[PDB]
Amino acid sequence: IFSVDKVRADFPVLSREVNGLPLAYLDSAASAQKPSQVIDAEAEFYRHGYAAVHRGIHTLSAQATEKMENVRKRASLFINARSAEELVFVAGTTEGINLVANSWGNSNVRAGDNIIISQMEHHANIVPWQMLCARVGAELRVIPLNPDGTLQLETLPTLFDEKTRLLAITHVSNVLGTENPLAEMITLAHQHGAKVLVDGAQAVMHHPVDVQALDCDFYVFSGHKLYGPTGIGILYVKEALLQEMPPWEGGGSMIATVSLSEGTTWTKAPWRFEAGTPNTGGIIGLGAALEYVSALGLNNIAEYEQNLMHYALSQLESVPDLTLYGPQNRLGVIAFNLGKHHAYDVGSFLDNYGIAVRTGHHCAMPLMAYYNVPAMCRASLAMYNTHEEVDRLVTGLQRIHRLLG
């Protein structure tokens, strides 16, 4: 079992005070706080082992290179990839999707083809595909939403045809907390010879993830949502696909040879896609974040977050004129609006109480438009949040309503 008080003791920011009051950080879906184990693993590397990492001959550089490749191995096990060499280090989910969209997309999506996304996608999983369709003259198709925040799976037969090259789909919605039936959708997409890219940015911190069981072709996520440092993410690609993809960024450490008269040749893949000095510090911290989460147990995290969410949804029933968006089995986030008040104002009052929620469109304008609102509030309920923080949120919404209604 799980001791939230012991967990919270690892997170130095949680004792912070905001606006003179004790912080209730309910915005982990935008970015997560980090434990000391993560912060200090990075600092300790800079303090005692720092060096360039391009298998330098001297000791510090040789040892730094090995730490980085160990983190790649650890990450591959975390998501149950077959091979470490199926993981590419990227700046985050966003860079990973752009890398796929340019490297794989440009040599596999021709004029007259189509790509499928869903209407709940984060902008990171829309814009790169809009750009690709514009480059090659293909069509972007959209799986629409039901009112409860789930996909209209019955439209798939009209969207999938033999010219469908790619399904790009979110694992868990950053707004609705909907979890999509990836395994079945992937089976369907493969029947048509389409690849599937899964945006897993909101999944990998809530429960185990197994890319072999999913059979997805690409999977991406971000360190900083996984209680880890900024500037680092993971792109996973099936080995057979990755060995075929051409390079995207060019430069050092991704070449085999550079000639000004005979041209340049590329190195093997995963390193073919990592040009220049990596974010070695972030890679170290990411490794520590994976160890920390693994040590708690993703199934113990899932069980605690489930209880916290069930508690919050029941307590929120006592808020007048509250509107919720999404299914009842949501993971992680609660999206809502309060009566007719604009989300911007609700969030400002909540901030004035020391409660940090996110307001706005959440990098999901098509989702906002489907619900015919311009913005929502979103409270994140993460592994280090408490029943008392849920109570502060409920009281807050009540006072905001009494005062502004």
Ligand X SMILES: Cc1ncc(COP(=O)(O)O)c(C=O)c1O
Active site residues per annotation: 363
> Of a copy of itself, ligand X, none, which one does residue 322 interact with (CB within 5 to 8 Å by kind)?
none
Toward ligand X, which CB reaches closer, 113 or 179?
179
Toward a copy of itself, which CB reaches closer, 7 or 38?
38
- For the CB of residue 27, give the shortest distance to a copy of itself in the complex, in Å: 7
> Of a copy of itself, ligand X, none, which one does residue 57 interact with (CB within 5 to 8 Å by kind)?
a copy of itself
Helices (H), ranges, 118-222: 127-136, 156-159, 182-191, 211-214
* Coil, strand or helix at 90: strand
- Which residues in the 63-92 window bind ligand X by CB under 6 A? 92
Tokens of 270: 């995963």
> Any idea what DSSP says for residue 169?
E
Task: Name the segment binding ligand X (CB under 6 A); options: 63-71, 78-86, 178-186, 194-202.
Answer: 194-202
- Using CB under 6 A as the binding rule, whether residue 335 contacts ligand X is answered as no
DSSP string, 316-373: HTTSTTEEEES-TT--SEEEEEETTS-HHHHHHHHHHTTEE-EEE-TT-HHHHHHTT-
The helix (H) or strand (E) run that includes residue 67 is helix 59-78
User: Which residue from 116, 117, 120, 124 is in contact with ligand X, where contact means CB under 6 A?
Assistant: 124
> Of a copy of itself, ligand X, none, which one does residue 153 interact with (CB within 5 to 8 Å by kind)?
none
Tokens of 401: 């309503």
State the helix-helix crossing angle for 343-352 and 387-404, rounded to 10 degrees: 120
User: Per-residue x/- mask for ligand X, residues 258 to 297, rule CB under 6 A?
Assistant: ------------------xx--------------------
Toward a copy of itself, which CB reaches closer, 85 or 274?
274
- Using CB under 6 A as the binding rule, whether residue 178 contacts ligand X is answered as no
Q: What angle do CA 92, 94, 100 make, to 5 degrees?
A: 105
User: Per-residue x/- mask for ligand X, residues 89 to 118, rule CB under 6 A?
Assistant: ---xxx------------------------
Toward ligand X, which CB reaches closer, 205 or 296?
205
From the DSSP assignment, how many helices (H) and strands (E) are in the chain? 14, 17
Strands 114-118 and 164-170: parallel
The 3-class secondary structure across 269-322, one letter per residue, is CCHHHCCCCCCHHHHHHHHHHHHHHHHHCHHHHHHHHHHHHHHHHHHHCCCCCE
- Using CB under 6 A as the binding rule, whether residue 246 contacts ligand X is answered as no
- For the CB of residue 96, give the shortest distance to ligand X in the complex, in Å: 8
Toward a copy of itself, which CB reaches closer, 92 or 238?
92
Q: How far is CA 227 from CA 84, 205, 282, in A?
A: 22, 8, 12
> Of a copy of itself, ligand X, none, which one does residue 403 interact with (CB within 5 to 8 Å by kind)?
none
> Of a copy of itself, ligand X, none, which one does residue 170 interact with (CB within 5 to 8 Å by kind)?
ligand X
Q: How far apart are CA 299 and CA 355, in angstroms?
A: 27
Task: Name the segment binding ligand X (CB under 6 A); options: 119-127, 186-194, 281-289, 379-387.
Answer: 119-127
Q: How far apart are CA 381 and CA 177, in angstroms?
A: 11
- Using CB under 6 A as the binding rule, whether residue 122 contacts ligand X is answered as yes
User: Which residue from 98, 222, 280, 337 is in contact with ligand X, where contact means CB under 6 A?
Assistant: 222
- Using CB under 6 A as the binding rule, whether residue 34 contacts ligand X is answered as no
- For the CB of residue 222, give the shortest distance to ligand X in the complex, in Å: 3
What is the longest distance spanned by two Cα atoms in the chain? 75
Q: How far apart are CA 28 and CA 331, in angstroms?
A: 12
The helix (H) or strand (E) run that includes residue 145 is none
Toward a copy of itself, which CB reaches closer, 238 or 343?
343
359-379 CB burial, b ≥16 within 10 A, e <16: bbbbbbebbbebbebebbbbb
User: Which residue from 76, 118, 170, 178 is in contact with ligand X, where contact means CB under 6 A?
Assistant: 170
Q: Tell how far CA 369 is from the center of its chain.
A: 22
Toward a copy of itself, which CB reaches closer, 91 or 373?
91
- Using CB under 6 A as the binding rule, whether residue 179 contacts ligand X is answered as no
Residue ranges that bind ligand X, judged by CB under 6 A: 92-94, 122, 124-125, 170, 174, 199, 201-202, 222, 276-277
